[PDB]
């Protein structure tokens, strides 16, 4: 955890009052509104271009499907739409007074306009026909959200406890009254499920009743009365649910057949959760209670306190609205006193790979290992700091900053730290295998055993006797490959003896060895790509090689295909080992 | 070559030498392949540390066709066999 203050937003910007924020799902832009009655859109440079005066702000949102900004007023029945891109103004009359909320569907081009009387309608733009629905609710609506899936269902909550189910014609089949007003409800969907099966849980303050809408099976869940009422309800991970308690205890619930088993419970916080949010794209749970911030992560062993406490100044105000961005990089918190504090949650774009395993960052201190075979996370690596660059091998993951590198021995599911090693020069690039490691510095490569055995082999420095500068290296289980502008050399790790050496007359800028250290797709000075088979030592230029695209990735599933890309596009090269014309390396073409 | 079955090492080595000797004399009979016998001789010579013989039959094996799930392994084997005293 690193707390760095970039800038301070005083109350003179938005005024003393509620702070309304709107985060663009794709663009790095945010709209802000306050008691000043103006619209402030913040760019990457923080410079104010123009202020849009609009008073009595209620809510804000940005649309992703058509990138259209919607502005509504509470004192007028007409809605004015202003397009910033075309500088055009239009007026569309919804014929409803005292508007309270506006929401757009990110999956379908369908929108609904509501009223404080509890009426929701469906608008057909093509036919200009509106179907009025009346007498659905008798009190003021609280909130209304859309389900981001193929299920075209609209959920609106209010202070009158009722559940309405209607067909395509809008006919209400039945209405079941509830003993008390529900507090909140959330819907979670399964992205990997083709049919997107979802279940809804209804809370009855002191009771939890689960009704299966498909099998029509009714079961009564008995819970201890000493647990207390549920404070907040939010969606969990893989259909799980997280419920708070008056005692502040967070409990993990497991479903064993038809029973619920309490494996363990820990009282982490003493007060109720003021605000809770769930990040679907990040899977991170954060809770704020008074001047305390807690982070909850679902682990196999349970919940353990980190032992670190931070005190927040009371002069910044008590938070009342909290919204986490989908990407998890931008955090904006608005306070009722007009003070806005921005926290930078850095997630490094440093990644590595080995075989079917890809190593990326899930949090600041955890490296996530994803297996492409199953497309799911299989293991996690603890990280002491934020590394500048990471590299992967077989049962070895290295992560380094500047001139130091920390080594972990991951296994597939646990990780074991081995050692942190400093080097006299910054490590420009790094490769590693299970037993040894190659670190690039002094214009050369140091190959050393990572294990700190008292009888370890003496580390070696490559190239020897001096040829030219090294351009790139690669490492495998038994082979060490180093490429210069003159020669590409492979050494057997069991003896450090030269076996393969290919001389390139046209030079070399960037070499890209295959995972088995047998084929090198290297780019010479003449902007040409040569697919050299290090076994038979044959240099074959790649047909159709665009010199604009510079980077090469070798496929891990197929040993005859690799990909050449630049910042925008990519092309696939196929390596045929034998044909009438010999071994070839050809770009895939179009019909 | 094609089955995970128990085998003798020296007997298979001498069988491979005999097949290599008598396969180039005339037209090879149907369903007797040079790739399989060369791969067997190379692997057994590498295992039995016939390193000079192994690299000779490997440089010969470079000039035949192997199954689609064998080229990578034979590349690794022939690159590793280039070490060790001849």
XYZ file of C-alpha atoms in Angstrom:
677
model
C 0.000 0.000 0.000
C 1.446 3.335 -1.175
C -0.415 6.557 -0.336
C 0.628 9.385 -2.673
C -1.253 12.689 -2.813
C -1.348 14.111 -6.347
C -3.735 17.065 -6.002
C -6.333 18.436 -3.587
C -9.828 19.482 -4.684
C -11.208 22.171 -2.383
C -14.865 23.030 -1.826
C -14.517 26.053 -4.143
C -14.778 23.801 -7.220
C -18.138 22.091 -6.627
C -19.506 23.891 -3.563
C -20.707 22.547 -0.233
C -23.188 19.778 -0.959
C -23.629 16.377 -2.537
C -21.096 15.357 -5.195
C -22.424 13.539 -8.272
C -19.932 11.625 -10.414
C -20.275 9.747 -13.699
C -17.571 7.407 -15.008
C -17.298 6.585 -18.696
C -17.057 2.775 -19.052
C -14.506 2.957 -21.897
C -13.100 6.482 -22.211
C -10.994 7.884 -19.326
C -13.428 10.763 -18.777
C -15.502 11.677 -15.719
C -18.373 14.143 -15.320
C -18.788 15.939 -11.990
C -21.634 18.027 -10.581
C -22.209 19.796 -7.282
C -24.113 22.573 -5.518
C -22.650 25.106 -7.982
C -25.099 23.821 -10.606
C -22.493 23.211 -13.313
C -21.149 20.255 -15.296
C -17.380 19.691 -15.145
C -15.908 17.105 -17.529
C -12.323 16.181 -16.638
C -9.800 15.073 -19.263
C -6.404 13.416 -18.815
C -4.691 16.808 -18.415
C -7.149 18.199 -15.856
C -7.716 21.434 -17.787
C -11.233 22.880 -17.722
C -12.536 23.577 -21.232
C -16.079 24.749 -20.453
C -18.652 24.610 -17.660
C -22.216 23.581 -18.485
C -24.699 25.304 -16.119
C -27.405 22.938 -14.877
C -28.903 23.309 -11.406
C -30.683 20.882 -9.060
C -28.571 17.865 -9.987
C -30.141 14.489 -9.166
C -28.148 11.807 -11.006
C -25.685 11.363 -13.860
C -24.613 8.543 -16.164
C -22.779 7.966 -19.444
C -24.098 5.690 -22.193
C -21.799 3.128 -23.814
C -23.823 1.825 -26.779
C -24.221 5.107 -28.690
C -22.073 7.473 -26.546
C -25.047 9.814 -26.066
C -25.276 12.107 -23.037
C -28.722 12.505 -21.459
C -29.609 15.525 -19.306
C -32.891 15.715 -17.385
C -34.570 18.388 -15.271
C -36.830 17.961 -12.248
C -38.744 21.248 -12.629
C -39.719 20.666 -16.282
C -41.552 17.859 -18.063
C -39.390 18.220 -21.197
C -35.994 16.570 -21.682
C -33.315 18.466 -23.610
C -30.631 16.451 -25.411
C -27.360 18.175 -26.323
C -24.778 16.395 -28.480
C -21.236 17.596 -27.802
C -19.811 15.984 -30.950
C -22.168 17.765 -33.371
C -23.127 20.797 -31.203
C -26.808 20.064 -31.873
C -29.717 20.599 -29.472
C -33.010 18.696 -29.596
C -36.093 18.445 -27.388
C -38.117 15.265 -26.814
C -41.207 15.438 -24.599
C -41.764 12.414 -22.359
C -44.977 14.057 -21.033
C -44.083 13.135 -17.435
C -43.675 15.578 -14.551
C -41.193 15.445 -11.653
C -38.642 13.078 -13.159
C -36.388 11.417 -10.587
C -34.076 8.967 -12.384
C -32.817 8.145 -15.875
C -31.083 4.941 -16.959
C -29.932 3.495 -20.283
C -29.498 -0.144 -21.292
C -25.931 -1.000 -22.305
C -26.937 -4.233 -24.085
C -30.059 -3.204 -26.034
C -31.258 0.073 -27.634
C -34.245 0.212 -25.265
C -34.938 2.926 -22.691
C -37.763 3.547 -20.234
C -39.056 6.773 -18.692
C -40.493 6.682 -15.178
C -42.311 8.926 -12.724
C -42.518 9.402 -8.964
C -46.032 7.889 -9.049
C -44.622 4.410 -9.712
C -45.382 4.169 -13.443
C -42.942 2.603 -15.908
C -43.558 2.482 -19.660
C -41.906 1.078 -22.782
C -41.142 3.441 -25.669
C -41.163 2.342 -29.318
C -39.164 4.885 -31.317
C -40.095 3.565 -34.771
C -43.881 3.559 -34.301
C -43.999 6.420 -31.735
C -46.360 4.309 -29.613
C -46.259 4.361 -25.807
C -47.959 1.663 -23.717
C -49.126 3.222 -20.416
C -48.857 1.187 -17.218
C -50.716 2.600 -14.215
C -51.555 1.665 -10.612
C -48.414 -0.485 -10.338
C -47.077 1.389 -7.291
C -48.633 3.891 -4.894
C -45.498 5.412 -3.307
C -42.226 7.007 -4.381
C -39.727 4.805 -6.203
C -36.317 4.303 -4.588
C -34.069 2.962 -7.357
C -34.242 1.229 -10.720
C -31.529 -0.862 -12.370
C -31.176 -2.924 -15.544
C -29.841 -6.463 -15.942
C -26.841 -6.417 -18.363
C -27.747 -9.611 -20.215
C -30.159 -11.034 -22.783
C -32.878 -11.194 -20.100
C -35.048 -8.159 -20.915
C -36.361 -7.583 -17.395
C -36.796 -4.255 -15.597
C -36.576 -4.147 -11.796
C -37.871 -1.164 -9.809
C -37.907 -1.007 -6.002
C -40.012 1.252 -3.792
C -41.356 1.574 -0.253
C -44.434 -0.588 -0.917
C -43.456 -4.272 -0.536
C -44.699 -6.148 -3.601
C -43.435 -8.511 -6.299
C -45.015 -8.220 -9.751
C -44.489 -10.728 -12.570
C -45.946 -9.857 -15.972
C -45.974 -11.498 -19.392
C -45.249 -9.817 -22.736
C -48.702 -8.176 -22.609
C -48.062 -6.557 -19.216
C -50.779 -8.506 -17.391
C -50.079 -9.043 -13.690
C -50.689 -12.699 -12.841
C -50.691 -12.285 -9.051
C -49.461 -10.039 -6.243
C -48.115 -11.498 -2.989
C -47.922 -8.960 -0.127
C -44.837 -8.980 2.078
C -44.739 -8.643 5.891
C -42.297 -5.714 5.751
C -40.548 -3.376 3.317
C -37.438 -4.969 1.764
C -34.166 -3.068 2.037
C -32.171 -4.061 -1.054
C -31.780 -6.813 -3.641
C -29.076 -7.625 -6.192
C -28.906 -9.818 -9.295
C -25.775 -11.712 -10.351
C -25.294 -13.455 -13.692
C -22.934 -16.209 -14.835
C -20.903 -14.976 -17.810
C -19.591 -18.435 -18.758
C -23.083 -19.978 -18.645
C -24.622 -19.973 -22.158
C -28.167 -19.754 -20.751
C -27.196 -17.294 -17.961
C -29.033 -19.004 -15.117
C -29.725 -16.625 -12.226
C -31.449 -16.901 -8.849
C -32.993 -14.132 -6.745
C -32.851 -14.005 -2.940
C -35.466 -12.102 -0.920
C -34.629 -10.806 2.559
C -37.309 -10.412 5.228
C -35.301 -8.445 7.833
C -35.340 -11.315 10.353
C -35.952 -14.123 7.835
C -34.291 -15.518 4.708
C -36.659 -17.482 2.455
C -35.336 -19.124 -0.723
C -37.888 -20.115 -3.374
C -36.830 -21.979 -6.517
C -38.755 -20.427 -9.411
C -38.125 -23.511 -11.596
C -38.586 -26.598 -9.399
C -41.136 -24.857 -7.108
C -39.426 -26.340 -4.036
C -39.916 -24.505 -0.735
C -37.427 -24.777 2.133
C -37.351 -22.906 5.446
C -33.933 -21.720 6.597
C -33.435 -21.502 10.354
C -30.759 -19.109 11.622
C -29.697 -18.047 15.101
C -31.580 -15.024 16.421
C -28.355 -13.666 17.954
C -26.911 -13.072 14.467
C -29.060 -9.964 13.985
C -30.466 -8.172 10.976
C -28.742 -7.784 7.605
C -27.345 -4.307 6.944
C -26.233 -4.416 3.291
C -26.727 -6.867 0.427
C -24.400 -7.162 -2.563
C -23.447 -9.711 -5.198
C -20.536 -12.078 -4.654
C -18.382 -14.410 -6.761
C -19.799 -17.358 -8.748
C -23.325 -16.861 -7.425
C -22.301 -16.398 -3.791
C -23.853 -13.735 -1.568
C -22.309 -11.536 1.126
C -24.498 -10.281 3.976
C -23.541 -7.887 6.749
C -24.612 -8.057 10.377
C -25.298 -5.579 13.167
C -22.319 -7.006 15.076
C -20.070 -6.292 12.081
C -19.171 -9.953 11.517
C -18.678 -11.169 7.937
C -19.517 -14.847 7.428
C -18.710 -17.122 4.489
C -21.575 -19.395 3.428
C -21.083 -22.749 1.691
C -23.866 -24.831 0.134
C -23.503 -28.566 0.824
C -26.355 -30.054 -1.187
C -29.494 -28.548 0.345
C -27.805 -27.414 3.587
C -25.789 -24.326 4.510
C -22.592 -24.984 6.474
C -20.772 -22.296 8.474
C -17.112 -23.251 8.106
C -15.930 -20.235 10.096
C -16.681 -16.666 11.092
C -14.456 -13.779 12.183
C -15.495 -10.406 13.620
C -13.332 -8.038 11.590
C -15.290 -4.791 12.055
C -17.376 -3.487 14.952
C -19.634 -1.029 13.093
C -21.975 -1.500 10.151
C -20.798 -1.103 6.561
C -21.602 2.447 5.462
C -21.191 1.581 1.772
C -20.210 -1.600 -0.078
C -19.411 -2.078 -3.767
C -18.528 -5.093 -5.909
C -16.282 -4.954 -8.961
C -17.428 -7.417 -11.616
C -14.370 -6.836 -13.803
C -11.921 -6.914 -10.882
C -13.433 -9.190 -8.224
C -12.332 -6.951 -5.335
C -14.540 -6.260 -2.305
C -13.949 -3.038 -0.365
C -15.766 -1.797 2.736
C -15.677 1.631 4.393
C -16.797 2.060 8.013
C -16.263 5.435 9.752
C -12.560 6.343 9.239
C -11.600 2.712 8.521
C -11.156 1.004 5.144
C -11.111 -2.781 4.831
C -10.428 -5.099 1.902
C -12.091 -8.520 1.690
C -10.756 -11.303 -0.542
C -12.195 -14.819 -0.737
C -9.446 -17.316 0.113
C -9.395 -21.064 0.688
C -8.063 -20.777 4.253
C -10.320 -17.950 5.449
C -9.827 -14.338 6.557
C -6.674 -13.019 8.229
C -5.992 -9.420 9.308
C -3.078 -7.612 7.685
C -2.266 -5.712 10.889
C -2.074 -2.321 9.141
C -4.351 0.540 10.198
C -4.828 3.956 8.598
C -6.577 7.015 10.035
C -8.500 9.323 7.701
C -8.853 13.017 8.496
C -12.362 14.115 9.465
C -11.957 17.458 7.661
C -12.546 15.766 4.286
C -16.122 14.881 5.264
C -18.043 11.650 5.768
C -18.408 9.696 2.490
C -21.967 9.068 1.319
C -21.600 7.929 -2.320
C -19.024 5.390 -3.490
C -18.697 3.991 -7.011
C -15.766 1.909 -8.232
C -14.802 2.061 -11.886
C -15.045 -1.144 -13.901
C -11.363 -1.047 -14.874
C -10.271 -0.468 -11.267
C -7.687 2.193 -12.143
C -9.677 5.354 -11.331
C -11.205 5.963 -7.894
C -13.283 9.093 -7.261
C -14.978 9.654 -3.895
C -17.419 12.522 -3.350
C -18.308 13.891 0.080
C -21.356 15.834 1.249
C -19.102 18.717 2.376
C -17.752 19.378 -1.128
C -14.306 17.798 -0.672
C -13.139 15.299 -3.303
C -10.129 13.028 -2.770
C -8.744 10.937 -5.641
C -6.847 7.719 -4.894
C -4.656 6.095 -7.556
C -4.987 2.293 -7.446
C -2.073 1.263 -9.643
C -2.248 -2.106 -11.379
C 0.902 -2.818 -13.355
C 0.724 -3.845 -17.008
C 3.670 -6.171 -16.357
C 2.979 -9.727 -17.494
C 4.865 -12.882 -18.429
C 4.161 -16.346 -19.773
C 5.340 -19.943 -19.874
C 3.570 -22.620 -21.886
C -0.154 -22.365 -21.201
C 0.384 -20.225 -18.077
C 0.112 -16.427 -18.195
C 1.218 -14.335 -15.209
C -0.520 -10.987 -14.680
C -1.612 -8.803 -11.755
C -4.885 -9.239 -9.858
C -3.985 -6.903 -6.975
C -0.952 -4.866 -5.949
C 0.668 -7.732 -4.017
C -0.718 -10.825 -5.798
C 0.290 -12.230 -9.189
C -2.493 -14.160 -10.901
C -1.616 -17.279 -12.888
C -4.167 -18.063 -15.603
C -4.212 -21.346 -17.531
C -5.361 -20.990 -21.138
C -6.447 -24.649 -21.245
C -9.274 -24.031 -18.757
C -9.425 -20.198 -19.088
C -9.618 -19.951 -15.272
C -7.223 -18.831 -12.553
C -5.423 -21.813 -11.034
C -2.789 -20.335 -8.690
C -1.666 -17.081 -7.085
C 1.798 -15.804 -6.154
C 2.481 -13.479 -3.193
C 4.546 -10.426 -4.143
C 6.584 -8.329 -1.712
C 6.512 -5.148 -3.825
C 5.523 -3.798 -7.255
C 8.034 -5.252 -9.747
C 9.161 -3.316 -12.796
C 9.400 -6.450 -14.954
C 8.490 -10.107 -14.460
C 9.631 -13.277 -16.212
C 8.421 -16.870 -16.106
C 9.918 -20.332 -16.423
C 9.098 -23.881 -15.334
C 8.124 -23.806 -11.637
C 9.844 -20.428 -11.290
C 8.583 -16.838 -11.463
C 10.931 -13.860 -11.166
C 9.850 -10.278 -10.467
C 12.291 -7.386 -10.368
C 12.774 -3.650 -10.041
C 15.801 -1.866 -11.531
C 18.716 -4.062 -10.423
C 17.072 -6.456 -7.939
C 14.914 -9.521 -8.572
C 12.821 -11.692 -6.246
C 12.275 -15.369 -7.053
C 9.222 -17.521 -6.338
C 8.837 -21.265 -6.888
C 5.211 -21.680 -7.930
C 3.711 -25.144 -8.321
C 0.430 -26.471 -9.699
C -1.497 -24.804 -5.758
C 1.057 -22.841 -3.740
C 4.043 -20.530 -4.149
C 7.339 -20.600 -2.242
C 9.677 -17.621 -1.986
C 13.343 -18.441 -2.595
C 15.587 -15.351 -2.591
C 15.965 -11.698 -3.537
C 19.177 -10.956 -5.450
C 20.709 -7.562 -6.232
C 22.974 -6.976 -9.217
C 25.642 -4.322 -9.893
C 23.809 -3.051 -12.999
C 20.133 -2.597 -13.909
C 18.572 -5.731 -15.384
C 17.308 -4.773 -18.841
C 15.812 -8.206 -19.574
C 15.432 -11.470 -17.696
C 14.855 -15.150 -18.477
C 14.613 -18.044 -16.041
C 14.129 -21.797 -15.791
C 13.709 -24.196 -12.865
C 17.398 -24.403 -11.918
C 19.237 -21.419 -13.444
C 18.574 -17.819 -14.446
C 19.853 -15.449 -17.139
C 20.002 -11.728 -16.304
C 20.899 -9.093 -18.906
C 23.346 -6.397 -17.787
C 26.769 -5.003 -18.730
C 25.656 -5.511 -22.329
C 25.839 -9.256 -21.663
C 24.089 -12.073 -19.794
C 24.933 -13.576 -16.406
C 23.757 -17.189 -16.088
C 23.679 -18.372 -12.482
C 21.985 -21.063 -10.378
C 19.172 -19.486 -8.376
C 19.477 -22.036 -5.560
C 21.879 -20.760 -2.894
C 23.574 -24.098 -2.312
C 27.035 -23.947 -0.684
C 28.466 -25.984 -3.598
C 26.746 -24.189 -6.472
C 28.288 -23.933 -9.926
C 30.184 -20.772 -10.809
C 28.014 -18.349 -12.825
C 28.988 -17.812 -16.454
C 29.012 -14.651 -18.572
C 27.972 -14.644 -22.224
C 29.065 -13.947 -24.918
C 32.705 -14.961 -24.380
C 35.870 -13.446 -25.899
C 33.818 -10.631 -27.424
C 31.725 -10.693 -30.596
C 29.280 -7.723 -30.518
C 26.289 -6.419 -28.567
C 23.527 -8.805 -27.503
C 20.059 -8.077 -28.883
C 17.855 -10.664 -27.151
C 18.057 -13.986 -25.314
C 15.774 -16.901 -24.504
C 15.932 -19.755 -22.015
C 14.440 -23.245 -21.833
C 14.834 -26.394 -19.755
C 18.122 -27.587 -21.275
C 19.020 -24.842 -23.762
C 20.409 -21.337 -23.324
C 20.045 -19.129 -26.404
C 21.804 -15.805 -26.916
C 21.664 -13.677 -30.058
C 24.030 -10.905 -31.131
C 24.069 -8.800 -34.279
C 26.450 -11.415 -35.743
C 25.748 -14.875 -34.291
C 22.929 -16.834 -32.656
C 24.322 -19.421 -30.247
C 22.657 -22.204 -28.256
C 24.350 -23.991 -25.350
C 23.382 -27.181 -23.529
C 22.709 -26.330 -19.885
C 23.952 -29.699 -18.600
C 27.478 -28.901 -19.828
C 27.489 -25.243 -21.038
C 29.042 -26.524 -24.270
C 28.402 -25.051 -27.707
C 26.106 -27.145 -29.919
C 24.367 -24.789 -32.373
C 25.770 -21.587 -33.877
C 24.229 -19.707 -36.807
C 25.981 -16.745 -38.441
C 23.766 -13.956 -39.797
C 25.475 -11.810 -42.432
C 22.700 -9.201 -42.709
C 22.808 -8.417 -38.980
C 20.107 -8.748 -36.355
C 17.968 -6.240 -34.446
C 15.393 -8.302 -32.509
C 15.388 -12.100 -32.243
C 12.386 -14.219 -31.201
C 13.212 -17.828 -30.340
C 10.606 -20.576 -30.187
C 9.710 -22.000 -26.744
C 11.822 -25.108 -27.429
C 14.866 -23.012 -28.495
C 15.038 -24.580 -31.965
C 13.596 -21.976 -34.383
C 14.433 -18.260 -34.356
C 12.393 -15.685 -36.273
C 14.962 -12.885 -36.353
C 14.821 -9.481 -38.056
C 17.966 -8.293 -39.821
C 19.103 -4.755 -40.626
C 17.423 -4.868 -44.062
C 13.914 -5.031 -42.499
C 13.503 -8.726 -43.342
C 12.368 -11.628 -41.161
C 14.352 -14.873 -41.353
C 12.974 -18.118 -39.894
C 16.200 -19.932 -39.025
C 15.974 -23.572 -37.966
C 18.837 -23.873 -35.478
C 19.055 -27.654 -35.970
C 19.966 -27.798 -39.666
C 21.159 -24.147 -39.763
C 19.092 -22.919 -42.714
C 18.077 -19.268 -43.066
C 14.745 -18.776 -44.847
C 13.152 -15.358 -45.235
C 9.473 -15.064 -44.356
C 7.293 -14.436 -47.398
C 5.104 -11.351 -47.243
C 6.840 -10.024 -44.127
C 5.658 -6.460 -43.572
C 8.611 -4.455 -42.167
C 6.174 -2.171 -40.314
C 5.262 -4.935 -37.849
C 8.218 -5.541 -35.538
C 7.183 -7.902 -32.721
C 6.977 -11.700 -32.954
C 5.209 -14.130 -30.609
C 5.674 -17.887 -30.942
C 2.509 -19.932 -30.477
C 2.553 -22.235 -27.456
C -0.062 -24.710 -28.728
C 1.378 -25.183 -32.239
C 5.088 -25.346 -33.051
C 4.694 -24.414 -36.741
C 2.794 -21.111 -36.382
C 3.792 -17.728 -34.984
C 2.402 -14.195 -35.127
C 3.998 -10.888 -36.154
C 2.332 -7.741 -34.840
C 2.719 -3.998 -34.425
C 0.750 -1.506 -32.331
C -2.397 -1.916 -34.476
C -2.578 -5.139 -36.534
C -1.031 -8.593 -36.850
C -0.344 -11.345 -39.377
C 0.159 -15.085 -38.969
C 3.224 -16.903 -40.320
C 3.216 -20.674 -40.891
C 6.449 -22.701 -40.864
C 6.306 -25.801 -43.067
C 9.192 -28.174 -42.235
C 9.217 -30.044 -45.559
C 7.671 -29.667 -49.012
C 8.719 -29.728 -52.664
C 10.512 -26.390 -52.179
C 12.074 -27.281 -48.828
C 11.227 -25.776 -45.468
C 9.156 -22.619 -45.914
C 7.882 -19.748 -43.767
C 4.866 -18.113 -45.397
C 2.360 -15.463 -44.381
C -1.285 -16.503 -44.452
C -3.052 -14.713 -47.304
C -6.634 -13.840 -48.230
C -8.961 -15.541 -50.691
C 8.410 -47.038 -31.907
C 4.604 -47.118 -31.878
C 3.790 -48.872 -28.591
C 4.643 -48.278 -24.895
C 5.879 -51.848 -24.465
C 8.823 -53.426 -22.614
C 11.927 -53.812 -24.744
C 15.547 -54.884 -24.704
C 18.141 -52.190 -25.351
C 21.213 -53.909 -26.814
C 19.102 -56.327 -28.864
C 17.083 -53.431 -30.289
C 20.322 -51.559 -31.029
C 21.733 -54.487 -33.007
C 18.381 -55.006 -34.749
C 18.436 -51.341 -35.760
C 21.981 -51.686 -37.100
C 20.968 -54.750 -39.134
C 17.878 -53.004 -40.518
C 19.919 -49.934 -41.460
C 22.441 -52.178 -43.196
C 19.921 -54.253 -45.151
C 17.305 -51.578 -45.907
C 19.375 -49.668 -48.495
C 20.484 -52.749 -50.464
C 17.340 -53.011 -52.608
C 13.764 -51.752 -52.723
C 12.389 -51.612 -49.181
C 9.307 -53.810 -48.609
C 5.884 -52.315 -47.984
C 5.157 -50.988 -44.466
C 8.848 -50.936 -43.532
C 9.690 -47.285 -42.893
C 13.087 -45.623 -42.697
C 11.893 -42.928 -40.294
C 10.833 -45.373 -37.585
C 14.020 -47.450 -37.747
C 16.226 -44.343 -37.804
C 14.375 -42.876 -34.810
C 14.717 -46.160 -32.911
C 18.440 -46.411 -33.660
C 19.027 -42.770 -32.707
C 17.138 -43.017 -29.416
C 18.760 -46.312 -28.398
C 22.245 -45.073 -29.323
C 21.631 -41.924 -27.276
C 20.425 -44.015 -24.330
C 23.292 -46.516 -24.635
C 25.785 -43.635 -25.086
C 26.771 -44.573 -28.636
C 27.225 -40.848 -29.068
C 29.237 -40.921 -32.304
C 26.829 -43.487 -33.747
C 23.941 -41.452 -32.316
C 25.018 -38.244 -34.050
C 25.737 -40.079 -37.313
C 22.276 -41.635 -37.368
C 20.825 -38.278 -36.249
C 22.386 -36.397 -39.159
C 20.971 -39.169 -41.340
C 17.600 -38.854 -39.556
C 17.543 -35.162 -40.483
C 16.809 -36.285 -44.052
C 13.632 -38.323 -43.496
C 10.037 -37.560 -42.519
C 8.747 -38.109 -38.977
C 5.192 -38.140 -37.571
C 3.563 -34.836 -36.658
C 4.148 -35.466 -32.920
C 7.858 -36.319 -33.223
C 9.706 -33.410 -34.904
C 10.052 -31.285 -31.757
C 11.413 -34.161 -29.680
C 13.825 -35.226 -32.388
C 15.039 -31.619 -32.728
C 15.730 -31.457 -28.991
C 17.436 -34.868 -29.022
C 19.709 -34.059 -31.955
C 20.641 -30.679 -30.485
C 21.504 -32.267 -27.132
C 23.490 -35.088 -28.756
C 25.880 -32.539 -30.300
C 27.496 -32.228 -26.858
C 29.464 -35.040 -25.097
C 32.805 -36.410 -26.366
C 32.712 -38.112 -29.768
